[PDB]
Amino acid sequence: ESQPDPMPDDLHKSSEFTGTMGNMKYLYDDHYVSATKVKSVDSFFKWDLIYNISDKKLKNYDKVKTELLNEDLAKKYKDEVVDVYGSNYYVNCYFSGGKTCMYGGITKHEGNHFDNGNLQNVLVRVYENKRNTISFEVQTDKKSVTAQELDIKARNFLINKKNLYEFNSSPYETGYIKFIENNGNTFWYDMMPAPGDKFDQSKYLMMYNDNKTVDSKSVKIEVHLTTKNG
Amino acid sequence: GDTRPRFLWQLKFECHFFNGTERVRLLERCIYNQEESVRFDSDVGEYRAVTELGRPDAEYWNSQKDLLEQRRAAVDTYCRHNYGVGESFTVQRRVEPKVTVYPSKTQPLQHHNLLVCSVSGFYPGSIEVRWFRNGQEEKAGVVSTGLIQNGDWTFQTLVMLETVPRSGEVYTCQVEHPSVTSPLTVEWRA
Amino acid sequence: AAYSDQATPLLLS
Amino acid sequence: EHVIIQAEFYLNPDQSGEFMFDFDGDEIFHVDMAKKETVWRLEEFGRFASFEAQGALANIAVDKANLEIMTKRSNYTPITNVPPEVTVLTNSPVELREPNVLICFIDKFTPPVVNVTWLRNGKPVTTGVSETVFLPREDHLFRKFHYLPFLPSTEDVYDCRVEHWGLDEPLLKHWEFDA
């Protein structure tokens, strides 16, 4: 069966987070690792894979480690020609040129693309206090794409047009992004930091562990937000 | 099957405490496969190769004045610090031993009764178990199985005593342990 | 109270 | 009178990594390298002290780099397999229908990789079993404990089946109600 939607008590409240929201913003504001047609070249622990990918942007790294939920996932992609897309971190990124870390984000490259640089649009509907406020689309070059890639793209958009995350706190109290698959399966991720005074980026991104992928041409996205009062 | 050779590396920082934090010794050691190659004894004050395989490192690390200074203060910032941090639930941990006395299920030689003093579930491991026949300690015939560390912060041990039982005799198993102010006693009435 | 750990130094390459 | 040991290791090519603290032979805690969190041996410890799990992952990365350096320096001298000494005992004198726990003590072995399974009348048991990580030894070999909660009876018999590269065949330690 599909994952049960969250109840208000199931969600993180930004009012209960006293750290710097800028540290959450940092992970989705024009921030991501992207590679096409590459194979892993190393591995630190049996559940992770290391690739040679350079930070063409600011030359901040040339090696990337992505951790997966288990050894089988790693075995599965170890010798595959894949594509990579995900949100990376540096604080507490460790493994034996600069380095960066991430989770999941792996997809087989063979016959997973569209001819002529064609991108697939995916519907995203935003709800604020239970009412649809805005709707739009994000795009991917993959037929089967990781939820992570789509999620990141949605949040990047909402940070610019809705100030989803600000240096200090957020305009919203709670928020979760929900994915609806054509088979009727659904799942969601909490978009707010755990309560406290410090945001552990590494721990948060771990949720992308499962390397969950969905069908780009048929999947639907819903972002549900709430302000503290209304 | 899996036949590829294995290569192992171990790093151990040992903090030795004598009379609380009065005297403290730090021992940092490196072991390649089953061989310690280089170490740092706070008593020596610098890295020393244990085998030729470690000579390069002892030489290299000793050339780093910062490291050496930091290592030299670890006896305080690391050892004494961590000792004080866990003292309450480690050094002071105490669980009273369960004591019971019964005859052995074996009993080899006829006119002889082999008594068993079972002492279990206690902590810490330091403990004294003695046997007495009519108020006077027994030296001979006494055989212990040794102190067994269960792996769960619990210990157990069995102390036997072969005897030439005579009606009316009182064989006592006495147990002294930090968990009690006075020794625990369990008697076997012959 | 927090436990402190000793950091491992790299070996001679 | 007291010893506290921070013990860590990395094993190639298994890619095994461990980091733990030891107090007079007993584990205080170890770090879960995958979940990146401190796992206390006893529940109450975590209510009196804390540890930044993230720190162990830094050490482990250096431990592996050093393994690679050392491996090459020794001209790829592999480790010699040392088979474990296996013993089975109960944590307290056994009495029919009286709750007890079977302990499988795996000691004096290396490298730190073993396969341990419990057998109830020749069949594998999965319910209620628990185990510890690899514990350090002065001679640099390892120890390890496996537990099986059970209810004694004259009918049930058990075995602790241990597999290790140093053992030509799987070793089975038998146990049955005798007392």
Q: Please give the annotated binding residues of A for Zn(2+), written as ranges.
A: 9, 83, 109, 113
Residue B4 one-letter amino acid: R
Both tokens assigned to B138? 């027994």
Q: Which of D78, D109, D130 is the last residue of a domain?
A: D78
Residue D119 and residue D74 share a domain: no
Torsion of CA B117, B123, B124, B126, to 10 degrees: 0
Residue D124 and residue D60 share a domain: no
Resolution of this entry, Å: 2.5
Proportion of chain A in helix, strand, coil states, percent, rounded to 5: 20, 35, 45
Cβ-proximal residues to B136 (8 Å cutoff; 6+ apart), any chain: none
- Please, do chains D and B touch (3+ CB pairs < 8 Å)? yes
Residue A165 one-letter amino acid: Y
The CA-atom distances, in angstroms, between A86 and each of A124, A206, B30, B56 are 19, 11, 38, 41
Asked whether B53 and D74 are in contact (CB, 8 A), the reply is yes
What's the CATH code of the domain at D33? 3.10.320.10
Burial of D115 (0-12, 13-18, 19+ CB in 10 A): exposed
CA distance D35 to chain B (A): 22
Give the domain extent around D38.
Answer: 1-78
Query: Touching B: which chains, 3+ CB pairs < 8 A?
Result: C, D
Q: Is B112 annotated as a binding residue?
A: no
Both tokens assigned to D125? 């048991």
Asked whether B159 and B120 are in contact (CB, 8 A), the reply is no
Count C/D contacts: CB-CB distance under 8 Å. 35
Residues of CATH 3.10.320.10 domain(s) within chain B?
1-92
Which residues on D lie below 8 Å from A67 (Cβ)? 34
The CA-atom distances, in angstroms, between B122 and each of A61, B127, B150, B169 are 54, 9, 10, 29
Q: Give the nearest chain B residue to D4 (CA atoms).
A: B15
Which residues on C lie below 8 Å from D8 (Cβ)? 8
Cα(A14)–Cα(A227) distance, rounded to whole angstroms? 10
Residues belonging to chain C with any Cβ–Cβ distance to chain B shorter than 8 Å: 1-4, 6, 8-9, 11-12
Cα(D120)–Cα(D125) distance, rounded to whole angstroms? 6
Cα(A114)–Cα(A127) distance, rounded to whole angstroms? 31
Of D1, D26, D80, the CB nearest to B17: D1
The strand pair at A144-146 and A213-215 is best described as antiparallel
Question: Which one-letter DSSP state was computed for residue D77?
Answer: -
Residue D74 and residue D98 share a domain: no
DSSP code string of D166-179:
T-SS-EEEEEE---
Asked whether A132 and A125 are in contact (CB, 8 A), the reply is yes
Burial of C13 (0-12, 13-18, 19+ CB in 10 A): exposed
What residues form DSSP beta bridges with A100? A64
This structure was determined by: X-ray
CA distance B22 to chain D (A): 11
Tell me if C6 and B67 make a contact (CB, 8 A cut-off).
no
Query: Touching D: which chains, 3+ CB pairs < 8 A?
Result: A, B, C
SS3 label, residue C6: coil
Which residues on D lie below 8 Å from B19 (Cβ)? 1
Which residues on B lie below 8 Å from C6 (Cβ)? 13, 28, 74, 78
Q: Which of D51, D78, D105 is the last residue of a domain?
A: D78
Which residues on C lie below 8 Å from B64 (Cβ)? 9
Domains of chain A and CATH, by start: 1-31+111-228 (3.10.20.120), 32-110 (2.40.50.110)
Both tokens assigned to B162? 């072969």
Residue D101 and residue D60 share a domain: no
Residue D124 and residue D62 share a domain: no
Both tokens assigned to D85? 């000494």
A69: Cα separation from own chain's centroid: 15
Q: What is the tally of structural domains in chain D?
A: 2
Burial call A32-52: b when 16+ CB within 10 Å, e when fewer: bbebeebebeeebbbbbbbbe
Largest CA distance in chain C: 37
Residue D20 and residue D97 share a domain: no
Tell me if C4 and B13 make a contact (CB, 8 A cut-off).
no
Cα(A94)–Cα(D19) distance, rounded to whole angstroms? 15
Cα(A191)–Cα(A174) distance, rounded to whole angstroms? 7
Residue D124 and residue D63 share a domain: no
Residue D117 and residue D50 share a domain: no
Cα(D150)–Cα(D130) distance, rounded to whole angstroms? 12
Q: Does residue B124 have a cis peptide bond before it, meaning omega lies within 30 degrees of 0?
A: yes
Cα(A66)–Cα(A63) distance, rounded to whole angstroms? 10
The CA-atom distances, in angstroms, between D160 and each of A112, D99, D103, D173 are 49, 19, 9, 5
Tell me if B61 and C6 make a contact (CB, 8 A cut-off).
no
Query: Touching C: which chains, 3+ CB pairs < 8 A?
Result: B, D
> Of B131, B115, B143, which Cα lies nearest the Cα of B176?
B131
Of B32, B37, B100, the CB nearest to D93: B100
Cα(A152)–Cα(A189) distance, rounded to whole angstroms? 11
Which residues on B lie below 8 Å from C3 (Cβ)? 82, 85-86
Which residues on D lie below 8 Å from C12 (Cβ)? 69
Residue D84 and residue D167 share a domain: yes
The CA-atom distances, in angstroms, between B155 and each of A39, A207, B130, C9 are 52, 41, 17, 37
Q: Give the nearest chain C residue to D69 (CA atoms).
A: C13
* HEC letters along chain B: CCCCCCEEEEEEEEEEEECCCCEEEEEEEEECCCCEEEEEECCCCEEEECCHHHHHHHHHHHCCHHHHHHHHHHHHHHHHHHHHHHHHHCCCCCECCEEEEEECCCCCCCCCEEEEEEEEEEECCCCEEEEEECCEECCCCEEECCCEECCCCCEEEEEEEEECCCCCCEEEEEEECCCCCCCEEEEEEC
Tell me if A96 and D62 make a contact (CB, 8 A cut-off).
yes
Q: Give the nearest chain D residue to B97 (CA atoms).
A: D92
Asked whether B119 and B98 are in contact (CB, 8 A), the reply is yes
Residue D110 and residue D25 share a domain: no
Tell me if D59 and C3 make a contact (CB, 8 A cut-off).
no
Residue D133 and residue D45 share a domain: no
Indicate the helix (H) or strand (E) that contains D70: helix D53-73
Residue C8 one-letter amino acid: T
Cα(D85)–Cα(D15) distance, rounded to whole angstroms? 25
Torsion of CA A143, A148, A153, A158, to 10 degrees: 140
> Of D144, D12, D28, which Cα lies nearest the Cα of D76?
D12
Tell me if C3 and D70 make a contact (CB, 8 A cut-off).
no
DSSP code string of A106-118:
EEE-TT-S-TTS-
Of D14, D15, D61, the CB nearest to A94: D61
The strand pair at A220-226 and A120-128 is best described as parallel
Kindly report the CATH class assigned to B93-190: mainly beta
> Of D7, D16, D2, which Cα lies nearest the Cα of D137?
D7
Both tokens assigned to B58? 């002892």
Q: Is D76 left (phi over 0), alpha (psi -120 to 50) or beta?
A: left
Q: Please give the annotated binding residues of A, written as ranges.
A: 9, 83, 109, 113
Which residues on B lie below 8 Å from D49 (Cβ)? 85-86, 89
Q: Which CATH number applies to B1-92?
A: 3.10.320.10
How many residues are there in chain D?
Answer: 179
Cα(B158)–Cα(B145) distance, rounded to whole angstroms? 6
Residues belonging to chain B with any Cβ–Cβ distance to chain C shorter than 8 Å: 11, 13, 28, 56-57, 59-61, 64, 67, 74, 77-78, 81-82, 84-86
CA distance A206 to chain D (A): 9
In the sheet that holds A220-226, the strands lie side by side as A131-140, A120-128, A220-226, A174-180, A186-190
Q: Is B76 annotated as a binding residue?
A: no
What's the CATH code of the domain at D112? 2.60.40.10
Both tokens assigned to B53? 């395989």
Q: Which of D78, D97, D124 is the last residue of a domain?
A: D78
Tell me if C12 and B78 make a contact (CB, 8 A cut-off).
no
Asked whether D153 and D96 are in contact (CB, 8 A), the reply is yes
The strand pair at D100-109 and D142-150 is best described as antiparallel
The strand pair at B155-163 and A120-128 is best described as unpaired
Tell me if B86 and D23 make a contact (CB, 8 A cut-off).
yes
- Please, do chains C and A touch (3+ CB pairs < 8 Å)? no
- Please, do chains C and B touch (3+ CB pairs < 8 Å)? yes
What residues form DSSP beta bridges with B23? B18
Q: Is D19 left (phi over 0), alpha (psi -120 to 50) or beta?
A: beta
Residue D68 and residue D16 share a domain: yes
Cβ-proximal residues to B8 (8 Å cutoff; 6+ apart), any chain: B31, B32, B33, B34, D9, D10, D11, D12, D67, D79, D110, D111, D112
